[PDB]
Short mmCIF file of C-alpha atoms and ligand atoms in Angstrom, two decimals:
data_model
loop_
_atom_site.label_atom_id
_atom_site.label_comp_id
_atom_site.label_asym_id
_atom_site.label_seq_id
_atom_site.Cartn_x
_atom_site.Cartn_y
_atom_site.Cartn_z
CA UNK A 1 5.17 39.01 -31.54
CA UNK A 2 2.61 38.69 -34.32
CA UNK A 3 1.94 40.78 -37.48
CA UNK A 4 -1.41 40.94 -39.25
CA UNK A 5 -1.56 41.95 -42.93
CA UNK A 6 -4.75 43.68 -44.12
CA UNK A 7 -5.67 44.79 -47.66
CA UNK A 8 -8.63 47.17 -47.78
CA UNK A 9 -10.04 49.90 -50.02
CA UNK A 10 -8.56 53.36 -49.76
CA UNK A 11 -10.56 55.86 -47.63
CA UNK A 12 -12.44 53.07 -45.90
CA UNK A 13 -11.42 53.07 -42.17
CA UNK A 14 -11.23 55.65 -39.43
CA UNK A 15 -7.77 57.33 -38.94
CA UNK A 16 -7.33 55.71 -35.48
CA UNK A 17 -8.92 52.26 -36.00
CA UNK A 18 -5.77 50.32 -36.61
CA UNK A 19 -3.68 52.13 -33.91
CA UNK A 20 -6.48 51.50 -31.42
CA UNK A 21 -6.49 47.79 -32.27
CA UNK A 22 -2.70 47.64 -32.03
CA UNK A 23 -2.78 49.29 -28.61
CA UNK A 24 -5.40 46.94 -27.32
CA UNK A 25 -3.98 43.71 -28.64
CA UNK A 26 -0.26 44.13 -29.08
CA UNK A 27 -0.49 42.91 -32.64
CA UNK A 28 1.42 44.86 -35.25
CA UNK A 29 -0.72 45.65 -38.27
CA UNK A 30 0.57 46.11 -41.86
CA UNK A 31 -2.30 47.90 -43.63
CA UNK A 32 -2.23 48.34 -47.39
CA UNK A 33 -4.87 49.76 -49.68
CA UNK A 34 -6.40 49.37 -53.17
CA UNK A 35 -9.07 51.17 -55.21
CA UNK A 36 -10.10 48.41 -57.61
CA UNK A 37 -11.82 45.04 -57.34
CA UNK A 38 -9.95 43.91 -60.48
CA UNK A 39 -6.62 44.62 -58.80
CA UNK A 40 -7.57 42.54 -55.78
CA UNK A 41 -9.00 39.68 -57.88
CA UNK A 42 -5.78 39.62 -59.95
CA UNK A 43 -3.69 39.27 -56.84
CA UNK A 44 -5.94 36.55 -55.38
CA UNK A 45 -5.82 34.58 -58.63
CA UNK A 46 -2.09 35.12 -59.47
CA UNK A 47 -0.38 33.61 -56.42
CA UNK A 48 -0.07 34.18 -52.74
CA UNK A 49 -1.17 37.61 -51.67
CA UNK A 50 0.54 37.41 -48.25
CA UNK A 51 -2.55 39.07 -46.74
CA UNK A 52 -4.48 37.65 -43.78
CA UNK A 53 -7.62 39.72 -44.58
CA UNK A 54 -8.91 41.24 -47.82
CA UNK A 55 -12.02 43.25 -48.62
CA UNK A 56 -13.69 42.39 -51.97
CA UNK A 57 -17.12 43.49 -53.06
CA UNK A 58 -19.59 40.66 -52.59
CA UNK A 59 -19.92 39.87 -56.31
CA UNK A 60 -16.13 39.51 -56.43
CA UNK A 61 -16.21 37.17 -53.47
CA UNK A 62 -18.89 35.16 -55.24
CA UNK A 63 -16.96 34.72 -58.39
CA UNK A 64 -13.83 33.58 -56.68
CA UNK A 65 -15.43 31.13 -54.23
CA UNK A 66 -15.13 27.99 -56.28
CA UNK A 67 -11.51 28.89 -57.06
CA UNK A 68 -10.92 28.15 -53.37
CA UNK A 69 -9.00 31.34 -52.73
CA UNK A 70 -10.87 31.93 -49.40
CA UNK A 71 -11.25 29.82 -46.37
CA UNK A 72 -14.48 29.55 -44.40
CA UNK A 73 -14.77 31.77 -41.34
CA UNK A 74 -14.81 29.91 -38.06
CA UNK A 75 -17.69 31.62 -36.33
CA UNK A 76 -16.65 30.22 -32.90
CA UNK A 77 -13.73 32.67 -33.14
CA UNK A 78 -16.16 35.55 -33.85
CA UNK A 79 -18.31 35.70 -30.71
CA UNK A 80 -19.55 39.26 -31.73
CA UNK A 81 -21.04 37.83 -35.00
CA UNK A 82 -24.53 38.28 -33.61
CA UNK A 83 -24.15 42.06 -33.82
CA UNK A 84 -24.45 41.82 -37.57
CA UNK A 85 -27.92 42.48 -38.88
CA UNK A 86 -29.33 39.02 -39.60
CA UNK A 87 -31.51 40.32 -42.44
CA UNK A 88 -28.55 41.94 -44.16
CA UNK A 89 -26.74 38.62 -43.70
CA UNK A 90 -29.48 36.88 -45.72
CA UNK A 91 -29.01 39.37 -48.59
CA UNK A 92 -25.25 38.99 -48.58
CA UNK A 93 -25.78 35.24 -48.65
CA UNK A 94 -26.89 35.42 -52.27
CA UNK A 95 -23.15 35.78 -52.96
CA UNK A 96 -21.92 33.53 -50.03
CA UNK A 97 -24.47 30.89 -49.15
CA UNK A 98 -25.12 30.54 -45.41
CA UNK A 99 -22.51 33.36 -44.81
CA UNK A 100 -19.69 30.87 -44.67
CA UNK A 101 -16.85 33.00 -46.17
CA UNK A 102 -17.49 36.66 -45.68
CA UNK A 103 -18.20 39.28 -42.99
CA UNK A 104 -20.36 42.15 -44.38
CA UNK A 105 -18.44 45.42 -43.78
CA UNK A 106 -20.17 48.41 -45.52
CA UNK A 107 -22.94 48.90 -48.12
CA UNK A 108 -23.57 51.77 -50.54
CA UNK A 109 -24.48 52.85 -54.08
CA UNK A 110 -22.71 54.07 -57.26
CA UNK A 111 -24.06 57.44 -58.25
CA UNK A 112 -23.03 60.99 -59.27
CA UNK A 113 -20.84 63.28 -57.15
CA UNK A 114 -20.96 66.91 -58.18
CA UNK A 115 -20.09 70.49 -57.48
CA UNK A 116 -23.49 72.07 -56.79
CA UNK A 117 -22.57 75.60 -57.73
CA UNK A 118 -20.41 74.92 -60.75
CA UNK A 119 -23.06 72.59 -62.21
CA UNK A 120 -25.69 75.29 -61.82
CA UNK A 121 -23.34 77.91 -63.24
CA UNK A 122 -22.67 75.84 -66.36
CA UNK A 123 -26.02 74.08 -66.92
CA UNK A 124 -28.49 76.38 -65.14
CA UNK A 125 -30.59 76.32 -62.04
CA UNK A 126 -32.67 73.53 -63.57
CA UNK A 127 -29.58 71.26 -64.09
CA UNK A 128 -30.80 67.61 -64.04
CA UNK A 129 -29.01 66.70 -60.81
CA UNK A 130 -31.51 63.90 -60.01
CA UNK A 131 -30.76 62.10 -63.30
CA UNK A 132 -27.97 60.21 -65.02
CA UNK A 133 -28.62 62.80 -67.78
CA UNK A 134 -26.29 65.06 -65.79
CA UNK A 135 -23.26 62.96 -66.71
CA UNK A 136 -24.43 60.56 -69.55
CA UNK A 137 -26.13 63.00 -71.92
CA UNK A 138 -23.41 64.18 -74.42
CA UNK A 139 -24.88 67.72 -74.66
CA UNK A 140 -24.38 68.11 -70.88
CA UNK A 141 -20.90 66.64 -70.75
CA UNK A 142 -19.74 68.90 -73.63
CA UNK A 143 -20.70 71.84 -71.43
CA UNK A 144 -19.13 70.36 -68.28
CA UNK A 145 -15.85 69.33 -70.01
CA UNK A 146 -13.73 72.26 -68.86
CA UNK A 147 -14.88 72.19 -65.28
CA UNK A 148 -13.78 68.58 -65.18
CA UNK A 149 -15.53 65.18 -65.56
CA UNK A 150 -14.33 61.91 -63.99
CA UNK A 151 -15.53 58.29 -64.39
CA UNK A 152 -14.58 55.47 -62.15
CA UNK A 153 -11.92 53.14 -63.49
CA UNK A 154 -14.38 50.23 -62.97
CA UNK A 155 -15.60 48.61 -66.18
CA UNK A 156 -18.39 46.62 -64.55
CA UNK A 157 -19.86 49.69 -62.86
CA UNK A 158 -19.59 51.95 -65.85
CA UNK A 159 -21.09 49.45 -68.38
CA UNK A 160 -23.91 48.48 -66.03
CA UNK A 161 -24.81 52.14 -65.44
CA UNK A 162 -24.71 52.91 -69.17
CA UNK A 163 -26.83 49.90 -70.01
CA UNK A 164 -29.47 50.86 -67.49
CA UNK A 165 -29.48 54.47 -68.78
CA UNK A 166 -30.06 53.14 -72.35
CA UNK A 167 -33.06 51.11 -71.12
CA UNK A 168 -31.24 47.69 -71.27
CA UNK A 169 -30.79 45.20 -68.48
CA UNK A 170 -27.87 46.62 -66.45
CA UNK A 171 -26.59 42.97 -66.36
CA UNK A 172 -27.31 42.33 -70.04
CA UNK A 173 -25.99 38.94 -71.26
CA UNK A 174 -26.29 40.10 -74.95
CA UNK A 175 -22.92 40.85 -76.49
CA UNK A 176 -24.40 43.30 -78.98
CA UNK A 177 -25.60 45.56 -76.16
CA UNK A 178 -21.96 46.13 -75.13
CA UNK A 179 -20.38 46.47 -78.57
CA UNK A 180 -23.21 48.51 -79.98
CA UNK A 181 -25.24 51.01 -77.95
CA UNK A 182 -23.17 51.00 -74.76
CA UNK A 183 -19.92 51.50 -76.68
CA UNK A 184 -21.57 54.09 -78.96
CA UNK A 185 -22.59 56.25 -76.03
CA UNK A 186 -19.28 55.91 -74.19
CA UNK A 187 -17.32 56.99 -77.27
CA UNK A 188 -19.61 59.94 -77.69
CA UNK A 189 -18.92 60.88 -74.03
CA UNK A 190 -15.21 60.12 -74.02
CA UNK A 191 -13.73 63.30 -75.42
CA UNK A 192 -15.29 65.21 -72.50
CA UNK A 193 -14.01 62.90 -69.76
CA UNK A 194 -10.82 64.21 -68.11
CA UNK A 195 -9.81 60.87 -66.52
CA UNK A 196 -10.92 57.40 -65.43
CA UNK A 197 -9.88 56.89 -61.81
CA UNK A 198 -11.52 55.36 -58.78
CA UNK A 199 -9.99 57.44 -56.01
CA UNK A 200 -8.43 60.74 -57.22
CA UNK A 201 -11.98 62.12 -57.67
CA UNK A 202 -12.51 62.48 -53.89
CA UNK A 203 -9.91 65.25 -53.41
CA UNK A 204 -10.60 66.69 -56.83
CA UNK A 205 -14.27 67.11 -55.94
CA UNK A 206 -13.39 68.51 -52.53
CA UNK A 207 -11.02 71.14 -53.95
CA UNK A 208 -13.25 72.22 -56.84
CA UNK A 209 -11.02 70.71 -59.54
CA UNK A 210 -13.63 68.16 -60.86
CA UNK A 211 -17.26 69.23 -61.18
CA UNK A 212 -18.93 65.89 -61.87
CA UNK A 213 -17.85 62.31 -61.20
CA UNK A 214 -19.26 58.85 -61.24
CA UNK A 215 -18.59 57.97 -57.64
CA UNK A 216 -19.19 55.69 -54.70
CA UNK A 217 -21.63 57.40 -52.22
CA UNK A 218 -19.51 57.59 -49.06
CA UNK A 219 -16.46 58.71 -51.09
CA UNK A 220 -18.43 61.66 -52.35
CA UNK A 221 -19.80 62.43 -48.84
CA UNK A 222 -16.16 62.34 -47.67
CA UNK A 223 -15.31 64.92 -50.38
CA UNK A 224 -18.21 67.10 -49.20
CA UNK A 225 -17.05 66.91 -45.61
CA UNK A 226 -13.38 67.62 -46.56
CA UNK A 227 -14.49 70.77 -48.33
CA UNK A 228 -16.59 71.81 -45.31
CA UNK A 229 -13.67 71.23 -42.97
CA UNK A 230 -11.34 73.20 -45.23
CA UNK A 231 -13.82 76.12 -45.22
CA UNK A 232 -13.07 76.44 -48.94
CA UNK A 233 -16.58 77.41 -50.10
CA UNK A 234 -16.97 74.32 -52.34
CA UNK A 235 -20.37 72.56 -52.10
CA UNK A 236 -20.24 68.89 -53.07
CA UNK A 237 -23.34 66.71 -53.16
CA UNK A 238 -24.17 63.16 -54.24
CA UNK A 239 -27.15 61.82 -56.25
CA UNK A 240 -28.65 58.34 -56.44
CA UNK A 241 -30.31 59.13 -59.79
CA UNK A 242 -33.94 58.61 -60.58
CA UNK A 243 -33.30 55.93 -63.20
CA UNK A 244 -31.71 53.68 -60.59
CA UNK A 245 -28.17 52.83 -59.58
CA UNK A 246 -25.90 49.95 -58.56
CA UNK A 247 -25.92 48.90 -54.91
CA UNK A 248 -23.21 46.71 -53.36
CA UNK A 249 -21.78 45.24 -50.18
CA UNK A 250 -18.06 45.09 -49.42
CA UNK A 251 -17.04 42.17 -47.25
CA UNK A 252 -14.02 41.03 -45.23
CA UNK A 253 -12.68 37.60 -46.25
CA UNK A 254 -9.71 35.47 -45.28
CA UNK A 255 -7.34 34.12 -47.94
CA UNK A 256 -7.03 30.37 -47.79
CA UNK A 257 -3.26 30.63 -47.29
CA UNK A 258 -3.44 33.26 -44.54
CA UNK A 259 -0.48 32.97 -42.15
CA UNK A 260 -1.96 34.53 -38.99
CA UNK A 261 -5.58 33.41 -38.80
CA UNK A 262 -5.89 33.90 -35.04
CA UNK A 263 -4.85 37.58 -35.25
CA UNK A 264 -7.17 37.97 -38.28
CA UNK A 265 -10.15 36.69 -36.22
CA UNK A 266 -9.14 39.15 -33.50
CA UNK A 267 -9.36 41.99 -35.99
CA UNK A 268 -12.71 40.82 -37.40
CA UNK A 269 -14.12 40.59 -33.86
CA UNK A 270 -12.81 44.09 -33.21
CA UNK A 271 -14.69 45.36 -36.25
CA UNK A 272 -17.83 43.62 -34.96
CA UNK A 273 -17.80 45.76 -31.78
CA UNK A 274 -20.52 48.36 -32.21
CA UNK A 275 -18.50 51.35 -31.12
CA UNK A 276 -15.59 50.42 -33.52
CA UNK A 277 -17.60 50.13 -36.66
CA UNK A 278 -19.87 53.11 -35.84
CA UNK A 279 -16.79 55.28 -35.48
CA UNK A 280 -15.66 54.02 -38.96
CA UNK A 281 -19.03 54.98 -40.48
CA UNK A 282 -18.80 58.41 -38.88
CA UNK A 283 -15.51 59.09 -40.67
CA UNK A 284 -16.06 57.42 -44.03
CA UNK A 285 -19.76 58.29 -44.57
CA UNK A 286 -20.79 54.67 -45.36
CA UNK A 287 -23.54 52.51 -43.86
CA UNK A 288 -22.17 49.49 -41.96
CA UNK A 289 -23.88 46.06 -41.69
CA UNK A 290 -23.87 46.00 -37.88
CA UNK A 291 -27.32 46.29 -36.33
CA UNK A 292 -25.93 46.84 -32.81
CA UNK A 293 -23.86 49.81 -34.11
CA UNK A 294 -26.70 51.81 -35.62
CA UNK A 295 -27.68 53.93 -32.61
CA UNK A 296 -23.99 54.95 -32.25
CA UNK A 297 -23.58 56.27 -35.79
CA UNK A 298 -23.70 60.06 -35.98
CA UNK A 299 -26.96 61.77 -36.80
CA UNK A 300 -25.33 63.47 -39.81
CA UNK A 301 -24.56 60.04 -41.30
CA UNK A 302 -27.73 58.20 -40.28
CA UNK A 303 -30.08 60.89 -41.48
CA UNK A 304 -28.44 61.25 -44.92
CA UNK A 305 -30.69 59.56 -47.53
CA UNK A 306 -27.68 59.28 -49.89
CA UNK A 307 -26.09 56.99 -47.27
CA UNK A 308 -29.22 55.27 -45.87
CA UNK A 309 -31.68 55.56 -48.80
CA UNK A 310 -35.46 55.11 -48.18
CA UNK A 311 -37.50 52.20 -49.65
CA UNK A 312 -38.69 54.12 -52.76
CA UNK A 313 -35.01 54.63 -53.74
CA UNK A 314 -33.98 51.13 -52.71
CA UNK A 315 -36.65 49.84 -55.12
CA UNK A 316 -34.71 51.25 -58.03
CA UNK A 317 -31.30 49.80 -57.07
CA UNK A 318 -29.74 46.84 -58.93
CA UNK A 319 -26.84 44.50 -58.10
CA UNK A 320 -23.90 43.20 -60.14
CA UNK A 321 -24.08 39.86 -61.83
CA UNK A 322 -21.05 37.80 -62.74
CA UNK A 323 -20.85 37.55 -66.47
CA UNK A 324 -19.85 34.59 -68.62
CA UNK A 325 -16.41 34.72 -70.28
CA UNK A 326 -17.69 35.85 -73.73
CA UNK A 327 -19.45 38.91 -72.22
CA UNK A 328 -16.41 39.50 -70.03
CA UNK A 329 -14.20 39.56 -73.15
CA UNK A 330 -16.59 41.87 -75.04
CA UNK A 331 -16.99 44.22 -72.09
CA UNK A 332 -13.33 44.41 -71.24
CA UNK A 333 -12.26 44.97 -74.89
CA UNK A 334 -14.88 47.65 -75.21
CA UNK A 335 -13.57 49.34 -71.96
CA UNK A 336 -10.02 49.36 -73.29
CA UNK A 337 -11.29 50.96 -76.55
CA UNK A 338 -13.26 53.62 -74.62
CA UNK A 339 -10.39 54.56 -72.29
CA UNK A 340 -7.95 54.90 -75.18
CA UNK A 341 -10.58 56.83 -77.09
CA UNK A 342 -8.74 60.14 -77.52
CA UNK A 343 -5.73 58.60 -79.41
CA UNK A 344 -4.98 59.39 -83.08
CA UNK A 345 -4.85 56.53 -85.57
CA UNK A 346 -3.44 56.18 -89.10
CA UNK A 347 -5.21 53.10 -90.56
C1 LIG B 401 -28.32 49.25 -42.33
O1 LIG B 401 -28.13 49.35 -43.80
C2 LIG B 401 -29.00 50.21 -44.50
C3 LIG B 401 -30.10 49.24 -44.99
O2 LIG B 401 -29.64 48.78 -46.24
C4 LIG B 401 -30.64 48.82 -47.25
C5 LIG B 401 -30.42 47.52 -48.19
C6 LIG B 401 -29.00 46.89 -48.04
O3 LIG B 401 -31.31 46.59 -47.68
C7 LIG B 401 -32.44 46.47 -48.41
C8 LIG B 401 -33.50 45.96 -47.43
C9 LIG B 401 -34.85 46.05 -48.07
N1 LIG B 401 -33.45 46.77 -46.14
CL1 LIG B 402 -21.49 43.51 -54.59
CL1 LIG B 403 -24.56 62.71 -33.30
#
């Protein structure tokens, strides 16, 4: 009797995927969840995670490759590997050369989730919902404060978005960009931000408790769908803003010390079945990386340009770079200062 341990993002599988795999294979699954790349990386670098499969973003897989925390995937144990789109594989390979360590899972963008009606009530019918101005212009956040503003608790995402908005390289390697203009803007915004959190914003958007959030696309579409299902009269939408946004792939990987590799390959091959991953996309409102699955994904998901954006929008997307340790120090210190920003001092 074997037991497979999986560590995935919250809100990132269909409700019946694991039970269906358990029923089919007889394998018992222990499924645990996270909402932060930094939490997962800390576990991978601190000791044994005890997990057989983990799901980093691709730039987090990249940065940990030479640490040897992952073992290469034996493709002979993944006969359904050919269902993955081979062009998407080439893009993922920028982070994982020759696709040796990672199985692409889902792809999306980091944009703005918002309450359509409350934004228009507060900012007017002309509210700049197609722009990062909605959430990064202080004059707008000051007005939105009471209806509730959330930022992701993701320093890399937040600084890269701010840098881009300020007309800098979103992956700037210049320390002064972080300590100066990016920090200046974030401190100006900070009094109007209710919280930094990377998962509470889904239900808060759905229930009308947060009016604007920096959010991951399919999480915001899940909020929208939860409100629709609740018949609660809340209208949530998502914007990939006109100034561009971050795009990313999340990938399954196998820790080098995984106990139950055979069961792990069984689960990956299960996810490679087109019906399995299409059903996941239908529930989580994210694009998968499986070419064979695409015709099976629901029309509502496939036809949503905030899930499958067209070429003119894709042209404005950027990807995360791994920063050197001096930028990492500057950025992380600045993030701690920003998040503590409301506190009173006596110096
Ligand atoms: C099936 O995933 C949606 C397609 O993803 C779009 C991004 C990842 O690719 C860019 C290239 C140009 N197509
Ligand atoms: Cl990524
Ligand atoms: Cl359909």
